[PDB]
Amino acid sequence: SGFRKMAFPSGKVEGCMVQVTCGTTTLNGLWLDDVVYCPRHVICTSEDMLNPNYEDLLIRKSNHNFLVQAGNVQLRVIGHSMQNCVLKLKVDTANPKTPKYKFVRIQPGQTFSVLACYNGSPSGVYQCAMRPNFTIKGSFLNGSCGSVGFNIDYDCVSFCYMHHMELPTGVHAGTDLEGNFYGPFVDRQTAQAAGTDTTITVNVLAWLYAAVINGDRWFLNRFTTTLNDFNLVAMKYNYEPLTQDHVDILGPLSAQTGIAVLDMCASLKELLQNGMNGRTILGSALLEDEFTPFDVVRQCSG
Amino acid sequence: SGFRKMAFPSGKVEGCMVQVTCGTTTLNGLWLDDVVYCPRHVICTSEDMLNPNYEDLLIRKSNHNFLVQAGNVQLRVIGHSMQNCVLKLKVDTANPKTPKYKFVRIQPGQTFSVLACYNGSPSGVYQCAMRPNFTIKGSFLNGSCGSVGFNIDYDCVSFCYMHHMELPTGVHAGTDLEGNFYGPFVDRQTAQAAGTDTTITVNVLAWLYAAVINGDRWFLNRFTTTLNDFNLVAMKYNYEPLTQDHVDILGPLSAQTGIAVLDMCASLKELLQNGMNGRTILGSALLEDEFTPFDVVRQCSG
Ligand SMILES: COCCCCNC(=O)C[C@H](Cc1ccc(F)cc1)NC(=O)[C@@H](Cc1ccc(Cl)cc1Cl)NC(=O)[C@H](N)Cc1ccccc1C#N
Ligand SMILES: COCCCCNC(=O)C[C@H](Cc1ccc(F)cc1)NC(=O)[C@@H](Cc1ccc(Cl)cc1Cl)NC(=O)[C@H](N)Cc1ccccc1C#N
Numbered sequence: 279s280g281f282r283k284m285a286f287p288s289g290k291v292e293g294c295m296v297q298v299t300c301g302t303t304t305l306n307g308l309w310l311d312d313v314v315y316c317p318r319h320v321i322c323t324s325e326d327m328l329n330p331n332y333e334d335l336l337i338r339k340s341n342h343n344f345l346v347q348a349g350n351v352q353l354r355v356i357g358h359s360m361q362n363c364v365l366k367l368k369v370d371t372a373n374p375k376t377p378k379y380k381f382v383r384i385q386p387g388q389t390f391s392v393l394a395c396y397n398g399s400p401s402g403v404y405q406c407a408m409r410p411n412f413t414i415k416g417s418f419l420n421g422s423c424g425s426v427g428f429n430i431d432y433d434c435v436s437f438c439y440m441h442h443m444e445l446p447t448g449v450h451a452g453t454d455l456e457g458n459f460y461g462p463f464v465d466r467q468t469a470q471a472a473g474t475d476t477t478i479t480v481n482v483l484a485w486l487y488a489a490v491i492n493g494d495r496w497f498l499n500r501f502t503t504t505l506n507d508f509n510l511v512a513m514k515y516n517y518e519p520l521t522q523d524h525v526d527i528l529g530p531l532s533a534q535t536g537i538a539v540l541d542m543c544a545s546l547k548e549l550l551q552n553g554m555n556g557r558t559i560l561g562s563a564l565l566e567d568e569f570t571p572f573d574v575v576r577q578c579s580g
Numbered sequence: 581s582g583f584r585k586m587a588f589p590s591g592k593v594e595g596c597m598v599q600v601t602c603g604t605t606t607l608n609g610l611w612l613d614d615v616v617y618c619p620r621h622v623i624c625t626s627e628d629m630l631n632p633n634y635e636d637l638l639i640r641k642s643n644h645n646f647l648v649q650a651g652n653v654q655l656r657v658i659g660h661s662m663q664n665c666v667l668k669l670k671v672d673t674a675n676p677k678t679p680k681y682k683f684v685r686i687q688p689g690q691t692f693s694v695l696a697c698y699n700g701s702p703s704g705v706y707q708c709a710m711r712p713n714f715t716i717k718g719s720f721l722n723g724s725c726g727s728v729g730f731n732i733d734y735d736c737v738s739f740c741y742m743h744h745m746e747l748p749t750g751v752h753a754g755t756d757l758e759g760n761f762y763g764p765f766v767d768r769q770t771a772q773a774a775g776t777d778t779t780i781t782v783n784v785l786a787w788l789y790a791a792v793i794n795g796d797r798w799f800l801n802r803f804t805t806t807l808n809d810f811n812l813v814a815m816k817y818n819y820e821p822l823t824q825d826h827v828d829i830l831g832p833l834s835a836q837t838g839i840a841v842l843d844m845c846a847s848l849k850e851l852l853q854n855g856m857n858g859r860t861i862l863g864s865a866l867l868e869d870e871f872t873p874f875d876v877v878r879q880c881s882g
Binding site: 279280281282283284285286287288289290292293393394400401402403404405406415416417418419420444448449450492493558561562563564576577579 | 581582583584585586587588589590591592594595695696702703704705706707708717718719720721722746750751752794795860863864865866878879881
């Protein structure tokens with residue numbers, strides 16, 4: 279029993295982290311087979327960052343302008359290219375620790391593990407969700423750029439996030455591993471604003487099912503509601519509308535606990551209307567929304 | 581910026597996890613050099629578990645009664661011994677992925693990362709504190725026994741916890757890697773009760789300093805207090821007494837933020853007396869006590 283913010287074991291990703299240096303700029307790269315992936319703003323000076331023309335800046339670079347370091351061993355760059363906002367550096371050595379992997383672009387509300395790195399070296403691992411406004415609430419300092427987010431499925435690592443920048447609000451923005459930003463952001467040093475965020479409704483509901491599975495039941499009630507009446511309450515408290523696809527995704531949890539989805543929605547409505555009144559759920563005093571239905575099934579007993 | 585429950589990268593420990601089978605009992609083991617460490621109750625049947633005589637049960641075992649599996653490759657057991665509540669199995673192969681490591685016995689209030697495993701295979705990683713009552717609030721299912729907790733310091737893995745059992749309250753009990761239980765517990769299947777728990781005061785204070793470092797300042801006040809007057813309030817709300825050693829440990833955070841420790845204590849007193857009144861700190865609606873002063877310095881900017 280018990281319920282924790284749980285990350286995937288990070289070893290398979292740790293074996294891929296390298297350091298990329300261009301000039302006086304240093305950040306992290308991802309070394310898979312004979313290619314290193316990193317944020318393209320590694321080629322920018324502090325002055326270039328305010329309004330870069332990346333095609334211009336890259337054409338002025340050659341292979342020997344890039345220093346890749348795997349541990350203390352330097353990797354020789356033999357080619358370089360640009361794909362959206364990621365730089366690809368071909369090296370002369372295939373990574374012998376390359377896991378089985380895929381690149382995936384996730385939807386808002388999905389979670390992933392982040393291996394935070396500095397100067398190519400892993401420092402810590404934590405769980406994140408992609409917020410509905412396409413930021414993540416990460417923990418990142420200067421030099422963390424190029425750290426990746428991932429999920430693992432049967433020894434296959436699915437990379438879904440590469441870290442690029444921190445916004446003025448302190449939240450974080452980045453790309454998929456093909457270099458496409460999540461959200462409307464661009465890789466230049468200007469003050470950029472994310473849209474207003476919302477709460478991930480299907481995840482809150484998943485986490486209420488985790489609580490029931492773990493013996494927290496004080497919030498349940500006998501009532502039920504309709505999808506339409508629930509969604510009126512969701513709008514009022516800045517929750518995402520509940521879709522029929524999300525009801526179906528919650529099927530397995532609903533069946534394991536005997537609590538129909540719309541039954542659990544009535545409990546959530548009461549929690550939104552009355553608060554918790556000093557009580558906690560799974561050790562939390564607010565409604566948690568960064569556990570997907572899959573996260574709950576993975577962590578909880580059957 | 582940002583603040584997350586952050587675990588250590590788990591790869592170095594992942595390379596040490598094996599599966600140990602004795603009869604119909606299977607659990608996890610830790611393979612370091614040519615020795616496998618696991619909970620000694622692997623030698624117990626379901627009937628033996630109610631009141632075992634372990635010396636009796638072990639003398640009735642031979643090396644070929646133990647099946648160690650590292651991946652699909654079986655390791656041959658060449659010796660076996662008992663050290664307190666851990667079983668040691670000498671195998672004929674030294675683990676080539678053995679990290680630099682140490683065994684350490686931690687104090688209550690210290691944190692560590694847990695690599696939760698099943699059938700020798702790592703499933704997830706999370707952060708725990710050793711509670712003042714010597715339990716941990718883990719996330720563990722059947723088959724997780726033998727999972728270890730650890731910290732990492734400059735590529736040296738310090739193992740501090742091996743998982744043995746879940747108590748009736750759903751919390752978790754285990755040993756150091758020399759097999760000595762944390763707390764008064766014993767490895768038999770009886771209903772055992774932990775003492776009443778308390779809140780880790782020095783950690784709450786550390787986390788308030790993390791919040792200031794991350795720009796949450798709404799809870800600060802101009803007041804200060806004495807160690808003696810604070811400790812009266814600590815008693816009232818079931819917080820551990822604040823010691824002078826703990827004040828000194830908070831020195832670096834105090835200096836980085838300009839807020840003297842006893843100044844921060846006055847803020848905590850007001851938070852205990854008045855609650856948060858609908859506001860959050862570092863995204864939490866309660867006072868978090870599983871971040872040590874070291875955890876905060878490690879994760880936060882200088
Ligand atoms: C309200 O309380 C919260 C307080 C929040 C305070 N937060 C900040 O002051 C961070 C600022 C906010 C900001 C300010 C003016 C702007 F005009 C744009 C953004 N952000 C960066 O300075 C950006 C600037 C930048 C670089 C390169 C690119 Cl492509 C894009 C940008 Cl925006 N630096 C990077 O992201 C680095 N790479 C990594 C880094 C460096 C330093 C600290 C964290 C990180 C991280 N992670
Ligand atoms: C209030 O809401 C919370 C609900 C809590 C409900 N929780 C439980 O029912 C778990 C029970 C509680 C209990 C009941 C009667 C007793 F008499 C003693 C303890 N605990 C175990 O059944 C013990 C029994 C046991 C075995 C071996 C030894 Cl040496 C010692 C013990 Cl105590 N099984 C193990 O720990 C396994 N190894 C691993 C395991 C197996 C299953 C589920 C988790 C785990 C884990 N992790």
